[PDB]
């Protein structure tokens, strides 16, 4: 099990930035979206590698409703529902060409990755994510077992605040991870 670690996914980033200091009183002001997540269920961050669904059979729109993309369709008994909050999530700066890097403790492999980015004109700070507001930026073939996977993404004409949505179809069974990463193209 794993996540997108660079550009950090929403829950991985909240964990990386605040996990050693998760009750820091400055968090509400400095990173309100992480604060609300930690207040909803701290296990969304402690279990940063558990954002998956089993059995989707490749039909992701059937099991991930609009407005629930970042929780993987309110997966895992609602643990990650706070990741669907709309607001000024902390971004990672990326260039037009950037690498999506996943860490996987188990070396499951991938049948494929799908990578999307929110369209120009979509404002993640004030609008819920929907499938219709995504544009596909890459689809890959299979990756063999490894503790890390890298997807070299190339985009042009994307500026400012976006969300990257990475879908990892693992190879050990029908299991899929749904990772939102807030990014800033500048």
Complex with Zn ion: residue 136 or 148, whichever CB lies closer: 148
The strand order across the sheet containing 97-104 reads 2-6, 97-104, 148-154
CB-nearer residue toward Zn ion: 107 or 130: 107
The binding site consists of 1, 6, 16, 29, 40, 66, 93, 103, 105, 108, 148, 184
**Least distance to Zn ion, CB of residue 12, Å:** 9
Q: Is 184 in the site for Zn ion (CB under 5 A)?
A: yes
Does position 1 interact with Zn ion (CB under 5 A)? The reply is: yes
> Strand runs (DSSP E) across 67-160, as ranges?
92-93, 97-104, 110-118, 134-139, 148-154
Alpha-carbon distance 80 to 70, whole Å?
A: 8
150 lies in the binding site for Zn ion (CB under 5 A): no
Closest by CA position to 128, among listed 90, 54, 71, 186: 71
Of 93, 99, 120, 135, the one binding Zn ion by CB under 5 A: 93
Query: Number of C-alpha atoms within 13 angstroms, CB side, residue 167?
Result: 28
> Residue 75 and residue 81: Cα distance in Å, rounded?
8
Options 99, 135, 136, 148; binder of Zn ion; rule CB under 5 A: 148
Query: What does the angle CA 96 – CA 73 – CA 143 come to, to the nearest 5 degrees?
Result: 50
* CB nearer Zn ion, residue 95 or residue 136: 95
Which of 21, 66, 96, 150 touches Zn ion (CB under 5 A)?
96
Whose structure tokens read 């990672």? 92
| 29 or 59: CB nearest Zn ion | 29
The footprint of Zn ion on residues 32-91 (CB under 5 A) is none
Q: How far apart are CA 15 and CA 157, in angstroms?
A: 31
CB of 50 to Zn ion, least distance (A): 9
The contact set with Zn ion (CB under 5 A) reads: 1, 6, 29, 93, 96, 103, 105-106, 148, 160, 184
């Amino acid at each position: 099990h794993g996540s997108v670690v660079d550009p950090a996914s929403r829950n991985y980033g909240c964990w990386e930035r605040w996990g050693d200091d998760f009750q820091n009183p400055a968090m509400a002001d400095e990173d309100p979206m992480c604060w609300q997540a930690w207040q909803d269920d701290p296990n969304a961050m402690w279990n940063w590698n558990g954002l998956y669904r089993n059995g989707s059979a490749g039909d992701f729109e059937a099991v991930v409703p609009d407005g629930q993309l970042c929780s993987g369709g309110r997966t895992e008994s609602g643990r990650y529902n706070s990741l669907d909050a709309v607001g000024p999530w902390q971004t990672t700066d990326v260039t037009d060409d950037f690498t999506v890097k996943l860490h996987d403790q188990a070396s499951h492999g991938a049948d494929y990755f799908l990578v999307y980015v929110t369209k120009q004109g979509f404002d993640p700070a004030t609008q819920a994510l929907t499938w219709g507001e995504l544009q596909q930026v890459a689809r890959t073939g299979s990756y063999g077992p490894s503790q890390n996977y890298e997807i070299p993404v190339s985009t042009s004409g994307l500026t400012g605040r976006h969300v990257v949505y990475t879908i990892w179809q693992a190879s050990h069974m029908d299991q899929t991870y749904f990772l939102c990463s807030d990014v800033d193209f500048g």
